[PDB]
Amino acid sequence: NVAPKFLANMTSVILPEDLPVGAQAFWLVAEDQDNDPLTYGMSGPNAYFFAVTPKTGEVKLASALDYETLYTFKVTISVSDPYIQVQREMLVIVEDRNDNAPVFQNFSTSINETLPVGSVVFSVLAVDKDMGSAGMVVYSIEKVIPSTGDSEHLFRILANGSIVLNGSLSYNNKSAFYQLELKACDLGGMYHNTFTIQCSLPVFLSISVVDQP
Amino acid sequence: NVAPKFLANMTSVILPEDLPVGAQAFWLVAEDQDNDPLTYGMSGPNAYFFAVTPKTGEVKLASALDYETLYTFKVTISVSDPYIQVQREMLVIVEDRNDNAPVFQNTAFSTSINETLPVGSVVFSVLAVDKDMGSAGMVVYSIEKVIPSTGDSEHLFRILANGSIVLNGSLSYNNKSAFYQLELKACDLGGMYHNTFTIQCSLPVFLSISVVDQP
Numbered sequence: 248n249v250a251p252k253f254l255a256n257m258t259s260v261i262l263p264e265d266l267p268v269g270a271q272a273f274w275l276v277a278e279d280q281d282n283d284p285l286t287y288g289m290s291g292p293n294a295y296f297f298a299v300t301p302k303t304g305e306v307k308l309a310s311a312l313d314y315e316t317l318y319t320f321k322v323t324i325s326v327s328d329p330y331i332q333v334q335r336e337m338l339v340i341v342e343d344r345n346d347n348a349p350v351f352q353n354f355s356t357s358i359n360e361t362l363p364v365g366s367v368v369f370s371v372l373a374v375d376k377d378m379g380s381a382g383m384v385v386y387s388i389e390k391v392i393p394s395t396g397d398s399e400h401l402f403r404i405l406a407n408g409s410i411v412l413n414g415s416l417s418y419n420n421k422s423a424f425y426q427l428e429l430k431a432c433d434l435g436g437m438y439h440n441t442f443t444i445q446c447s448l449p450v451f452l453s454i455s456v457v458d459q460p
Numbered sequence: 461n462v463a464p465k466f467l468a469n470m471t472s473v474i475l476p477e478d479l480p481v482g483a484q485a486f487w488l489v490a491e492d493q494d495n496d497p498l499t500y501g502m503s504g505p506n507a508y509f510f511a512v513t514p515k516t517g518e519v520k521l522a523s524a525l526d527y528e529t530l531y532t533f534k535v536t537i538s539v540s541d542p543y544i545q546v547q548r549e550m551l552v553i554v555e556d557r558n559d560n561a562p563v564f565q566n567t568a569f570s571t572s573i574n575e576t577l578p579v580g581s582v583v584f585s586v587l588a589v590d591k592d593m594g595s596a597g598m599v600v601y602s603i604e605k606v607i608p609s610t611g612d613s614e615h616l617f618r619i620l621a622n623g624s625i626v627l628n629g630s631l632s633y634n635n636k637s638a639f640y641q642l643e644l645k646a647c648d649l650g651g652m653y654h655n656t657f658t659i660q661c662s663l664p665v666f667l668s669i670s671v672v673d674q675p
């Protein structure tokens with residue numbers, strides 16, 4: 248008898264993290280000089296993510312992959328003829344997709360009506376579990392209510408999340424209260440073979456203008 | 461009132477994964493130009509590895525780190541004067557150590573070979589795997605003891621990088637032995653653990669060969 252020999256691609260597999268569960272991931276393929284029937288297996292602590300068909304070698308995903316929980320891990324693959332089991336190790340390299348969206352931290356301040364233009368009224372933070380460009384956050388005011396008095400222009404958000412006064416206020420001739428709606432969006436990434444900007448759920452900031460006559 | 465300002469190093473910390481739990485990790489340091497009293501905090505899904513004292517800023521490790529779970533992560537730090545709270549994101553970069561050792565999936569194996577098996581022919585195969593990656597994750601196999609340790613015994617077998625045990629000699633159920641027990645061991649090529657080059661090894665595993673008389 249000659250030991251079944253694994254092919255030369257069974258040392259590592261690259262699998263993306265968006266891969267659906269029950270998806271055909273790869274095939275355990277080996278060759279025997281004697282043509283004995285071959286039975287395939289996977290073992291060890293991280294073999295829960297996979298599901299080998301013990302006669303064909305079809306492996307399909309049985310647990311989710313996350314780059315933000317296990318970016319790479321090792322598994323024990325096995326080919327066995329009627330006389331010998333050959334066990335060998337495979338490195339699984341998982342690929343990052345933009346799977347996570349900016350999440351806001353805490354939203355109400357109270358600023359004086361005499362505040363100068365450019366003054367920082369408030370600051371917001373939002374974090375994306377993703378790293379690199381798919382983690383980078385862009386801040387947006389989606390609606391100021393009331394819309395009276397160029398409200399759409401009285402406030403500007405920057406990149407730090409500082410909200411800066413782009414205008415003048417008047418407790419008596421504009422409004423005593425603005426509600427700003429804020430979004431957070433990642434600079435972008437790949438999800439499902441397709442460039443995906445993942446955005447957050449609009450949060451609301453309640454500014455109260457203070458009358459100092 | 462001017463808002464507290466973090467120092468410019470509070471944007472990221474490089475932490476080794478051998479850092480024991482309850483160890484000073486780093487300090488949250490900020491500066492108020494009004495010199496107000498400062499109260500620090502850590503927030504977010506990944507602040508369970510950390511224990512911040514609110515008034516000092518001392519951060520200690522509350523949960524073990526691992527480069528083989530989470531090699532980099534983010535956490536919300538916070539500084540608050542009596543009047544305003546500043547939150548900011550911090551990036552934790554974890555560094556690999558030789559923390560993991562080669563592990564056999566079974567500690568006891570057992571086989572049967574025929575005395576007429578030619579020299580060079582593969583008897584058995586073993587695998588040991590290190591969760592560690594790189595040179596710290598490379599298993600070197602060794603035969604540490606033959607029992608029966610007769611002269612010939614210590615030269616009749618040889619383990620290879622693949623884990624294949626090969627015949628380096630000839631056998632005899634009658635004129636030699638009808639059993640050889642071999643102690644094996646799997647050692648990594650080496651790496652850094654507690655600021656010292658560490659070679660992490662496995663536990664003695666025993667392969668029981670049985671010779672078959674083919675007269």
Ligand SMILES: *[C@@H]1O[C@H](CO)[C@@H](O[C@@H]2O[C@H](CO)[C@@H](O[C@@H]3O[C@H](CO)[C@@H](O)[C@H](O)[C@@H]3O)[C@H](O)[C@H]2NC(C)=O)[C@H](O)[C@H]1NC(C)=O
Pocket residue numbers: 254256257258259260272273274275276
């Ligand atoms: C290493 O390479 C081997 C050999 O190329 C890969 O096995 C092959 O994988 C392909 C694609 O996954 C298989 O194709 C599929 O075949 C099924 C069955 O007929 C068919 O229904 C599908 O539509 C698809 O065509 C192919 O069967 C398989 N080749 C052999 C000889 O079995 C394997 O994916 C690679 N493994 C690793 C670890 O990267």
Ligand SMILES: *[C@@H]1O[C@H](CO)[C@@H](O[C@@H]2O[C@H](CO)[C@@H](O[C@@H]3O[C@H](CO)[C@@H](O)[C@H](O)[C@@H]3O)[C@H](O)[C@H]2NC(C)=O)[C@H](O)[C@H]1NC(C)=O
Pocket residue numbers: 467469470471472473486487488489
């Ligand atoms: C950012 O930089 C600051 C300032 O360089 C770092 O804070 C300082 O951290 C060191 C240790 O890294 C502290 O030293 C220790 O002091 C205590 C007594 O408080 C002593 O028991 C220890 O033996 C050690 O000497 C130091 O206190 C601290 N400095 C201040 C002004 O608090 C900080 O670690 C850095 N943060 C990051 C994210 O790297």
Ligand SMILES: [Ca+2]
Pocket residue numbers: 248249250251279280281282283328
């Ligand atoms: Ca064969």
Ligand SMILES: [Ca+2]
Pocket residue numbers: 264314315343344345346347377
């Ligand atoms: Ca991701």
Ligand SMILES: [Ca+2]
Pocket residue numbers: 345346347348349375377381382433436445
């Ligand atoms: Ca994202």
Ligand SMILES: [Ca+2]
Pocket residue numbers: 461462463464492493494495496541
């Ligand atoms: Ca202050």
Ligand SMILES: [Ca+2]
Pocket residue numbers: 477527528556557558559560592593
């Ligand atoms: Ca390690």
Ligand SMILES: [Ca+2]
Pocket residue numbers: 558559560561562590592596597648651660
């Ligand atoms: Ca190791």
Ligand SMILES: [Cl-]
Pocket residue numbers: 290291292293321322323589
């Ligand atoms: Cl394993």
Ligand SMILES: [Cl-]
Pocket residue numbers: 562563564662663
């Ligand atoms: Cl072991």
Ligand code: NA
Pocket residue numbers: 264312313314315346
């Ligand atoms: Na994910």
Ligand code: NA
Pocket residue numbers: 477525526527528559560
């Ligand atoms: Na580790």
